[PDB]
């Protein structure tokens, strides 16, 4: 087949070592390793076959190497194909499929990455203009579908809720030992699952949660992490502010039961909130307290902690093998995205020519894809509005700065079990310390 000259239609320039390179050791379609942006756009809108995986990876990651306005200009340019009888075949097997691929890209862009348009109204103006100029009978159905999407974008049986000492409605008595431990774990799992599910790839690609505009670009991610940090600190606080030893043993024991239920729910964020609290300086040194923890709960906590050993070897295997719903620990994804982006070149060079390194972007898109896969399935659990609100509004730090607060926790640790004879402290809980355990009531 014969195409226009590159001096009229830039996407006609043949492939070469200086244009496109492929992955050499890996659904019938070759894996692009690197290429100029012209070639990447060509293959993104290739006439010989659709390439949904390339489209998804591209639209998830292109902003590191191409700005949204530039991409719109480039796919418009691709669409406007000039002709060089044998034209009938050219129109059938080149113009038509390339233009359909362009509309497919527009459709996926507006559908899954509409945030580009919400942040640049002029981008949306250009897109609606472009779509409006599209006059074709083969195109009409795709054009109408795109317009519809754009218009829309401008706009089983759960178990019984468990109760312990606090009764329904008695918000004022809600606390670590008065709410039922199963229900604490369930409502924290609902909170943390929603927090996990709200995080979008746009907060992650580009490592933007580490940069000076993180608060603007990664608000859901930060809110999620901040909740996790808050719960860890609240667990440590509950422990070291319980100065009576017997009561402290009951507190630590209840927290291990909450951990057990987190494990039952595959809430690994919850597992690690607890594990991080137990590893904290103020808590880890409380030998007189762990002394009285029953050996079964010691084993529960031991298994959970071992999930984090060896750079999370066992956490990773267990996550690979569980079935949803679950709440992954996000920290590992963040490290892998950041180290992938920082540990690989943006550009490869071949024959003095610069080519966008696309494989590093594919690696980042695989990570964000795995996150999304665990955001699909929700938990079959009922919300308890008041328990939910209680955990949303936990604020163990109060007005203190981080250093002041963690120093105060460590000094409480030193006071309740000195480095010095062990003092006695009076009880603070009026109610019974015995746990209802972690099996339901029916």
């Amino acid at each position: 087949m014969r195409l226009p000259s590159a001096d009229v239609y830039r996407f006609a320039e043949p492939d070469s070592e200086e244009n496109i390179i492929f992955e050499e050791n890996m659904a019938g379609i070759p894996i692009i390793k690197a290429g100029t942006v012209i070639k990447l756009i060509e293959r993104l809108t290739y006439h010989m076959y659709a390439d949904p995986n390339f489209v998804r990876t591209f639209l998830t990651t292109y902003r590191s190497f191409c700005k949204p306005q530039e991409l719109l200009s480039l796919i418009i340019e691709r669409f406007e194909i000039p002709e060089p009888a044998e034209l009938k075949r050219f129109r059938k097997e080149y113009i038509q499929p390339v233009q359909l691929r362009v509309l497919n890209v527009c459709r996926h862009w507006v559908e899954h990455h509409f945030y580009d348009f919400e942040r640049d109204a002029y981008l949306l103006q250009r897109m609606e203009e472009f779509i409006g100029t599209v006059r074709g009978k083969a195109m009409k159905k795709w054009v109408e579908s795109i317009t519809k999407i754009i218009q829309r974008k401008k706009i089983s049986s759960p178990p019984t809720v468990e109760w312990h000492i606090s009764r329904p409605g008695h918000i004022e008595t809600f606390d670590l030992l008065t709410l039922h431990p199963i229900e604490i774990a369930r409502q924290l799992t609902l909170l943390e699952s929603d927090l996990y599910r709200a995080v979008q790839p746009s907060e992650l690609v580009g490592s933007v949660w580490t940069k000076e505009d993180k608060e603007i670009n990664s608000p859901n991610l930060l809110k999620m992490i901040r909740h996790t940090t808050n719960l860890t600190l609240w667990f440590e606080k509950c422990i070291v502010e319980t100065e009576n030893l017997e009561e402290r043993v009951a507190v630590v024991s209840r927290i291990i039961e909450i951990l057990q239920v987190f494990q039952e729910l595959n809430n690994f964020n919850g597992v690690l909130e607890v594990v991080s609290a137990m590893n904290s300086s103020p808590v880890y040194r409380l030998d007189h307290t762990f002394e009285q923890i029953p050996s079964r709960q010691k084993k529960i906590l031991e298994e959970a902690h071992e999930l984090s050993e060896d750079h999370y070897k066992k956490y990773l295997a267990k996550l690979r093998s569980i079935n949803p719903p679950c709440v992954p620990f996000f920290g590992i994804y963040l490290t892998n995205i950041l180290k992938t982006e920082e540990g690989n070149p943006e550009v490869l060079k071949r024959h003095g020519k610069e080519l966008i390194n696309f494989s590093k972007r594919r690696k980042v898109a695989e990570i964000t894809g795995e996150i999304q896969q665990y955001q699909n399935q929700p938990y079959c659990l009922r919300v308890e509005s008041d328990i939910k609100r209680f955990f949303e509004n936990l604020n163990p730090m109060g007005n203190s700065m981080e250093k002041e607060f963690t120093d105060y926790l460590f000094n409480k640790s030193l006071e309740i079990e000195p480095r010095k004879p062990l003092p006695r402290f009076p009880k603070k809980y009026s109610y019974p310390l015995k746990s209802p355990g972690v099996r339901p009531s029916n």
């Binding site: 030998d287 050996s295 031991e302 902690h305």
Partner: peptide
């Protein structure tokens, strides 16, 4: 020995 939640010796 090890962590306070490990088996003593």
């Amino acid at each position: 020995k090890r962590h306070p939640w490990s088996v003593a010796n």
